[PDB]
Amino acid sequence: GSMDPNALYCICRQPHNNRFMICCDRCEEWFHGDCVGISEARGRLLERNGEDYICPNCTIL
Ligand SMILES: [Zn+2]
Ligand SMILES: [Zn+2]
């Protein structure tokens, strides 16, 4: 549910207190723009338009 500071979600399993991160509605988790490929400018755009982003892990799973 609510993302925590000392939690893990991304495939690499790292804290969100490092680099940019994105929220996936598919699995309802968090990921890294670098790991998924999304750019800081791209992820920020989907947040403004309100487009439910889907990590590359779910799209192929
Ligand atoms: Zn990662
Ligand atoms: Zn996902």
CSV table of C-alpha atoms in Angstrom, one decimal, residues 21-40:
chain,number,residue,atom,x,y,z
A,21,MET,CA,11.3,6.5,-9.0
A,22,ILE,CA,7.9,5.7,-10.6
A,23,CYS,CA,4.7,4.2,-9.3
A,24,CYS,CA,3.2,1.2,-11.2
A,25,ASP,CA,-0.6,0.8,-10.9
A,26,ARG,CA,-0.4,-2.7,-12.5
A,27,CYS,CA,1.4,-4.4,-9.6
A,28,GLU,CA,1.0,-1.4,-7.3
A,29,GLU,CA,4.7,-0.9,-6.6
A,30,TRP,CA,7.6,1.4,-7.2
A,31,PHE,CA,10.4,1.3,-9.7
A,32,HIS,CA,13.5,3.2,-10.9
A,33,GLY,CA,13.3,5.4,-14.0
A,34,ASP,CA,16.7,4.1,-14.9
A,35,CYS,CA,15.8,0.5,-14.4
A,36,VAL,CA,12.6,0.8,-16.3
A,37,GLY,CA,14.1,3.2,-18.8
A,38,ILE,CA,11.7,6.1,-18.0
A,39,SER,CA,13.3,9.6,-17.9
A,40,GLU,CA,12.9,12.1,-15.1
